């Protein structure tokens, strides 16, 4: 039912920067973990718990201070804002939302998936 | 030299969405503190949300009354700070304006901020 | 090299007023059309022609006397001062300009956009 | 929305060969005019139809330039044979939605930078 699309990506230059979007439709609830995965040539890049109440983020240590993840709720959007790109940054972005998760980073925790926007830094 | 210049303030719904931007321009030089003030009429200044970057990378810093509900961000190619408000509240109402500096012992000490914007109105009803 | 950076719009009740700014930089030249455009999921508001020596005005039929455009040469910015709201001016107001345009209100002629700013009028 | 980064330029002797690269990154659609300008003259262009492209070239660098884009990398290639001093310039990526003519600088909507080649 819940159905993510990404966008944004393509390819850039070492040291640039690139904003990622993922829209959502369908009956979310209100509760859970939206989060950003990279399959490089499938680990969780950074995510954010809504707790339908306030909100807690989470960043992979290899990212951490060069990307931010952000939301619009109004708009149904995530966010994946990316700075001083890294060629160990290149992959196939997915985005993945759950209302349930141990580890924010397992892959296999999320339950809706979208096909993903690809990166590739020269 | 540095110039800012705040966009994106507007009138919104408690409970909305909103991203205000701002652009630098000048001889920032590569290290030191980029935040969002805001301020009300005849109130003092409080800082809401800043970054701090480094020679390479970015840390992050947010006021409790804010934390969870605004993000900051910035995008380095297009010298742009951006801040995300969602949740909007009535008491977030104010002029929001941006600051940045080489140096400040604090980070949301405004006395120590050496450039700033104009502003951009954000009004919650 | 244009960029257009918009304000001051949101939801505001019919009969109420809004005032949308959109600061420029960038080498622009010094003639030609700033306009705003209202975009509905783009038809031209206003415009003004600067020749560079006075300018003129130009406004669409459904808010001549009701909206207002100005600049201000000295901050680069443009206003639209918008009174007597109705629902029917909701949409996403952006901001564009050109140095040549057959028609002031042809967007497809303009080649600077700001990414918009939106109005909403219940 | 969208970001172009050009790269591959420089000083390069007359009679040589250069290849010029631009990526891309942002929502640019599926259909549209991805050229290169020389500063501001159209140096060459591809157009790509929904289906599935067609390409331009100035005349005087027809049997020269090439350009080609590999589609999967999102980037777009000029290759520069037989260079000459007047080649020398910023050579810079555009891209847009539509245009009229490939050609004309003022019908496109996104701009790189730009990559400086000299020829001595
Ligand atoms: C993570 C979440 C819940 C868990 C899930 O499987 C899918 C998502 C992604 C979109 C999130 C959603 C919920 O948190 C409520 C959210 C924030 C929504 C976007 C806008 C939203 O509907 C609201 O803002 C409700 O007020
Ligand atoms: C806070 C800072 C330094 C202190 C100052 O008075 C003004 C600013 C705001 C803009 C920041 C700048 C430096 O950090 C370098 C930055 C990040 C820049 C935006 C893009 C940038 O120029 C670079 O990314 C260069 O590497
Ligand atoms: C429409 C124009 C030229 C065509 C274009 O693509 C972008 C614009 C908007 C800003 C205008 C500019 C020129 O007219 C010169 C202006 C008025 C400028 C704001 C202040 C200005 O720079 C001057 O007043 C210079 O005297
Ligand atoms: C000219 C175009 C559309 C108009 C625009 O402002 C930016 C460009 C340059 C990149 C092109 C794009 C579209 O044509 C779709 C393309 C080909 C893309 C490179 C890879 C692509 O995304 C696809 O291959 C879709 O199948």
């Known amino acids: 039912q819940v159905q993510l699309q990404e966008s944004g990506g393509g390819s850039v230059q070492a040291g640039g920067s690139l904003r990622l979007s993922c829209v959502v439709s369908?009956?979310?609830?209100?509760?859970?973990?939206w989060a950003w995965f990279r399959q490089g040539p499938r680990e969780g890049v950074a995510a954010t718990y809504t707790a339908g109440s306030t909100s807690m983020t989470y960043y992979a240590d290899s990212v951490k201070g060069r990307f931010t993840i952000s939301q619009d709720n109004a708009k149904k959007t995530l966010y994946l804002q990316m700075n001083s790109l890294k060629p160990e940054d290149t992959g196939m972005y997915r985005c993945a939302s759950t209302r349930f998760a141990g580890r924010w980073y397992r892959d296999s925790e999320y339950r809706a998936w979208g096909q993903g926007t690809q990166v590739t830094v020269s | 030299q540095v110039q800012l210049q705040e966009s994106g303030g507007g009138s919104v719904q408690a409970g909305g969405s909103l991203r205000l931007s701002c652009?630098?321009?000048?001889?920032?030089?590569?290290?030191?503190?980029?935040?969002?003030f805001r301020q009300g009429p005849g109130t003092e200044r409080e800082g809401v949300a800043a970054t701090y970057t480094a020679g390479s990378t970015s840390m992050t810093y947010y006021a409790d009354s804010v934390k969870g509900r605004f993000t900051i961000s910035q995008d380095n190619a297009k010298k742009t700070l951006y801040l995300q408000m969602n949740s909007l509240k009535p008491e977030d109402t104010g002029m929001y304006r941006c600051a940045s500096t080489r140096f400040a012992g604090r980070w949301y000490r405004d006395s120590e901020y050496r450039a700033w914007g104009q502003g951009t109105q954000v009004t919650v009803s | 090299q244009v960029q257009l950076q918009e304000s001051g719009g949101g939801s505001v009740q019919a009969g109420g007023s809004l005032r949308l700014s959109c600061?420029?930089?960038?080498?622009?030249?010094?003639?030609?059309?700033?306009?705003?455009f209202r975009q509905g999921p783009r038809e031209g508001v206003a415009a003004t022609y600067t020749a560079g020596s006075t300018s003129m005005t130009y406004y669409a039929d459904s808010v001549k006397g009701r909206f207002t455009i100005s600049q201000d040469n000295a901050k680069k910015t443009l206003y639209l001062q918008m009174n007597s709201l109705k629902p029917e001016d909701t949409g996403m107001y952006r901001c564009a300009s050109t140095r040549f345009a057959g028609r002031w209100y042809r967007d497809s002629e303009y080649r600077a956009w700001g990414q918009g700013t939106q109005v909403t009028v219940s | 929305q969208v970001q172009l980064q050009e790269s591959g330029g420089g000083s390069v002797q007359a009679g040589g060969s250069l290849r010029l690269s631009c990526?891309?990154?942002?929502?640019?659609?599926?259909?549209?005019?991805?050229?290169?300008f020389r500063q501001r003259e159209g140096v060459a262009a591809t157009y790509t139809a929904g289906s599935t492209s067609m390409t331009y070239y100035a005349d005087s660098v027809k049997g020269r330039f090439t350009i080609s884009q590999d589609n999967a990398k999102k980037t777009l290639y000029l290759q520069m044979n037989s260079l000459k001093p007047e080649d020398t310039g910023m050579y810079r990526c555009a891209s847009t939605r539509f245009a009229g003519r490939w050609y004309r600088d003022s019908e496109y909507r996104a701009w790189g930078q730009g990559t400086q080649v000299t020829v001595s």
């Open positions: 369908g009956n979310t609830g209100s509760t859970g973990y």
